Amino acid sequence: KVLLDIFTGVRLYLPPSTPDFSRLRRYFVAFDGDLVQEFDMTSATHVLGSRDKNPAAQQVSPEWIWACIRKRRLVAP
């Protein structure tokens, strides 16, 4: 199977200001990611960018998303 279930169970808010937004989102969702809509932002498992608001989430990076898909599993932030 080409589409492996990598980001299963993770709810990530991807802000449209993020560079490479469309490709990042396409690949994240393609590997079982789950995007959170803006109004539902405070309740999400990870945040891309900065811990404001919702510091209860975990901050990651587009580099993190790419490294996860290339290691074919979840990995450290």
């Binding site: 080409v2 589409l3 396409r26 690949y27 969702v29 393609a30």
Partner: protein
Amino acid sequence: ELPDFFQGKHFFLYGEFPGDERRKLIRYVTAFNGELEDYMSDRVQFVITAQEWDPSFEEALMDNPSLAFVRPRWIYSCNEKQKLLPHQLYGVVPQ
């Protein structure tokens, strides 16, 4: 490195899908570079439904002649064969 055989194709998911089928269809259409629409319009090229033909299908046809009505198994098998299969194999028509 993902395939791109839905690129330029506009999809609308109409009606209710069983279980997580809606999420799965979103995943596959996005993966293969399909563009999913929040709303129906004459820019939609493929309506994906599990429900049966109703007069709104014909109303959308009269405003978009090239529109096609297809079952979610089209998307699933497109993923399985990793190819763009002919949607006519999985079409929805009046009953």
